[PDB]
Symmetry: C5
Subunit: 327 residues, 5 copies
């Protein structure tokens, strides 16, 4: 655990491989590289690939329990102290352009003061962010700077998705503005994404703090400071989002309340339009009858007689409508 | 970073600045002033404005991680220790004069004992309150008096706000009188405002207690005591408000069941008038036909006969109404 | 704060003013009294009186930060340490017959080892209890035993209030008594008063524990023991009302499903009556028509034949109801 | 206070009283007995009796604050250290066959290191089981053996009861086996029963825990371990029961959703029957008319010609629902 | 007690027993065996067998309280140290195809450094898994390896089960895919199984951590570390599952939302079809009448008159639907 060679880390199926000068150095690896704490080496892999998997399960540099903890196993943000070794993994929020369900994006990093290795399956964009700000050399200095910078990308895109849900539900003032119903099958979607992001950020906050509260031998205390309030930077993100689970609590309840209000104002029409069904029992009840008797023969022009008495009934009960509305 | 000349902090596009005397009064900022513990000064911006933002990003008087932080991006009622630097950022309750949604107002203070700087986007009632207090002449003596006074106005207006929420919901005694329903879409914004007040007071409670817990090098211990019971003042304030989220809990559930049981009474009317109008289709059954036979011709004057017999049918099943009310 | 003259305490608009002998008896206040810890005198005010407000805000006997606190603006209980001074503010359970909403029964006591002040606005039956018990010689000895006995009266009066709503709740076993229904808009009163008992007892419990938390120069350790098990009395009242919001929760849900199943019986009757009004369209569909042809003229006396056919259709589909209840 | 005599504890209206030998034996009382820790004595009363109340209020054994409160006051269990005294009060569950509501079957036991005294109101089968253990002859050794045996008794019977409601609700899965509805009001009363058992058990493993850390002068460390793990045996007791309030949480909700599923079946039938009886009203529209014109007289035998078209409306719309189910 | 003979633990009706070589190997028992920590023996039984029942009821090697505890009686995911003894008792997942209810698959272990013994009632597939691990020679080294390996089996199996219903409720995306209903009586099964696995895993996570924090002689610090991240390996298991109680919380609410929505758009038919149900007292209201007058005889061909005026009623008020849709 004192000498590291550039050859065994040099993988053909490796996606990404770099040196770290201490500035943001863009230097791809060789087969004759000196790798230490003075020369940290970023990697990035894809365990779907062939020799990424073989080198992932066979390399003599990293231990055995972290071999098959590193090729698509967990559903959780673990950290694990391995003496000098340090396993982190934490989750990001992307996919293709279209997977709004399954906000799980794994990214797994076995790392120490000398050599890191990062591994993914689907395309992380936060790792694309930490790539895309180092070609000009303003990115990370070392592995500690790498870790706090990728936590800055994670809090930035995770925080943007937090406020993205937040202005999806703050767009739901439509529940009182006209009392417009939200679209059919919609609140379960972002409310689903909301609670699953509770169960991913909610251990990710103290995986960040469990980084920052613990003294790894190779951060700076400035990196532990910005790590500390970046852990809090996830923290009020997560109380924003369980404020949003409350807000979809009231939202999802009172939309059911207002559609049963639509039931009630429908049964206004069922009530009074059932009171239009009232004189039918005497509409046919005197007139659809074929019997040998005298129902209305005693007075000529009987049509206006029932034509006024049925609205004596309708207007009278209509005057009871402004009195009791029952019985 | 020992002393600061008065023109260095001087910003044209600032809202203003000031000079705290220590007697509770104030003096405006001059160009050749001395900024120290002997002469503390409040300086206030509006970071919407242009050179406000330029000085906000380019001054040498505050570190990098508070440079962008005073530019209006977090939903975080946060304190951030920067050694001698001390950032706080707290929330108030306004908008324009008309926004009952979005009761969030950001105010920010970067702070050391010499200069204190408050930046806002929109206006703050509390900052106006300590304005009228400070050209009144018995406002803040110093920066400690600044903090305890601005927290007195923040807690005072927030406590008044949750007070008028409390009498809006204790005004909801239409549950008992008439069982009168609240207006269509009205508890979504009371209950919405209520939970968002939980989210913006509950980190603010321990931003207050997190101020009063540590020993900053510039407060009096009397200001720590005032800070302490004002922290608990907002604390049991939010105990009133989640008492109110329980009270909108029962209130929303019982309005849902009371209009639901109103609907149940409406279909009770539909049921009773349904079995009252059983014999209408049956009277069309016996009497609304066209056959080559004898319907009732063997006995004269059947109109009195059937208009008796359906009525005694209705009264019979009406005795089964009070008798059974089933089947 | 070494000696107090009998006129500074003396207020004309004072409701009560007393002299704790230490023997459990009492004496009224005189004008030339020297009161101390050996002569712990007593007050009771009503701050809505104007001279009560004047002495309440202008006396030199209590500091400024508790001057306004005794003037009736709280929504809450507290205890605030003021060095030698000690503030408690504290709630009770009172009103006349027509105040079962708004249990806001305030009771404020600023005190030390020598003097107390006990201000109210509306009457307090606990203070009425110890006023009913101090003249008979078996009241309190001094201020420690005073607020001991005060907490005795209000915690067993609040305890019997909690017991009273509890016997209403256990009087709601009519849910299984043939599903007998609570009155229209009634559980919002028990549930509302219940949770407002949770809020106005819950900081009160650790007001009491916060009394016996520290040593104070005017209690006994026996009175601290009395304080802790009386806090145990109240806190077990708090678990009583916690289980009452639970049991009231399941009550409020089951009455809603009782309304749902009664409505299911209403539309059960509407379903069976709908199948009873299936032969409307065959009834008029063969018989109420007016066309130039032969519908049933080919066989004489067809009244029994449509009686037979609609009976076998109705009883037939009733047998299909006995087959599979649907389709 | 020392060398307690048998005449002091001799109560005629007591239920019984014995000595504890150490073997689990049993010996009745005399009037010349030496009650010590070498010969511990159990007393058992029924405090509703008049002389039981007289000795209960007037004995020179136990102090004043445990005199009255031992006779029917606490709605809840507790411990209370009284120096040498140790008040305990527990709760068990019994009745006749008919008191399954009101599971408050109390147990008030003042403990002193020589005389231990138990008062009940109604009969408790737990102490009946300890009675069977002691006339059995291998019951309690001493007051410590008394305590572990009574806690084992009502711990076992509490565990059997929570097992009884557990396999009541594990029978409640015919609601997935062809969705058999639970009987009327059945969830409410056992849901009530185990939630008041959350009002008892969560105040019971804490009174056992305040037996656990409480190094009493008369416990044994073996028996400390005995009521330690029998305390946590009750601990997995109440995690069973709040798991069961979750399980009747879901079980309470899903019967409501399946209730509206059956309601959706019958308004499915009301919908299709309403649209299939739309042509009835237009049949009366064309054929229930008495006017001087030519409705359909221009072609002979119109009965088949409209009996076809009503069928093609019915089967036509019946083909529209097989593609749309809507409008 | 020291050199315990293999004949003492030899049971005829044992399911099996072996030694542990320290390599993962397997050797059957004899009756001339010396058992220690150097030769660790594992027994596995089935306590329903009467010979094994007599053995574990009557063997003199294990203590008294663990005798009936190992006899298979109660829902115990717990641990109790007995000095040199150690009772652990855990829960797994097994059954045939038809035991998805009753997820209790108990395994019980009395153990020490020397003689470690496991009882069960129904088969555990995790114990079968470690049997398959040891019979090939790659099983556990010692009793500590036996414990951590059987924890690896059953946490792997419980972990893939909580994964299994975790992606069974992700197969509940029919909620927005056409808003397709879940099957009738289905979420009580899945929702049942995840709350019951909160009931099981929630004491089992800290039976694991309570093993890990307990310095035991028969363990190793490597197995303590492996014990601790297998403890948290489960622990992210259970926050996955209460995340899933939230996700079936929103799912179970919105299915009632969407099926009442199906009722809601369903009674559009019972609104517009109700206002085509109103003119039945008009189209027969003038025309199904038998009276001696002139209803429409003054103008010829009345059939094309109402044949258009019912259209100017229906289409006109149908245009009032596009105006206000109510009243």
């Amino acid at each position: 655990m004192e000498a590291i060679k550039g050859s065994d880390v040099n993988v053909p199926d490796a996606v990404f491989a770099w040196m770290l000068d201490g500035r943001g150095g863009v230097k791809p690896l060789e087969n004759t590289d000196v790798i230490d704490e003075a020369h940290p080496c970023w990697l990035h892999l894809n365990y779907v690939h062939h020799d990424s998997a073989q080198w992932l399960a066979t390399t003599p540099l990293l231990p055995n329990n972290v071999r098959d903890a590193l090729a698509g196993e967990s559903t959780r943000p673990r950290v694990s102290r391995l003496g000098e070794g340090t396993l982190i993994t934490l989750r990001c929020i992307n996919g293709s352009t279209d997977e709004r369900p399954d906000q799980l994006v794994a990214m797994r990093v076995y790392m120490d003061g000398r050599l890191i290795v990062s591994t993914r399956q689907r395309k992380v964009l936060a790792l694309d962010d930490v790539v895309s700000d180092l070609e000009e050399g303003t990115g990370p200095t070392d592995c500690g700077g790498w870790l706090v910078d990728v936590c800055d990308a994670l809090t930035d895109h995770s925080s943007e998705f937090i406020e993205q849900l937040h202005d999806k539900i703050i767009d739901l003032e439509d529940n009182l503005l006209d009392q417009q119903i939200p679209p059919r099958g919609f609140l379960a979607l972002l409310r689903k994404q909301l609670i699953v992001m509770r169960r991913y950020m909610a251990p990710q906050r103290d995986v960040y703090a469990r980084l920052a509260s613990e003294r790894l031998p190779w951060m700076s205390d400035d990196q532990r400071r910005r790590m500390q309030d970046i852990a809090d930077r996830l923290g009020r993100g997560l109380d924003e989002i369980d404020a949003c689970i409350a807000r979809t609590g009231v939202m999802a309840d009172e939309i059911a309340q207002v559609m049963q209000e639509n039931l009630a104002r429908r049964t206004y029409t069922m009530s009074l339009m059932a009171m239009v069904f009232l004189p039918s029992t005497f509409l046919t009840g005197l007139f659809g009858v074929n019997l040998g008797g005298i129902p209305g023969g005693g007075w000529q022009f009987g049509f206006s007689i029932f034509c006024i008495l049925l609205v004596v009934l309708i207007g009278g009960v209509a005057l009871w409508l402004h009195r009791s509305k029952w019985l």
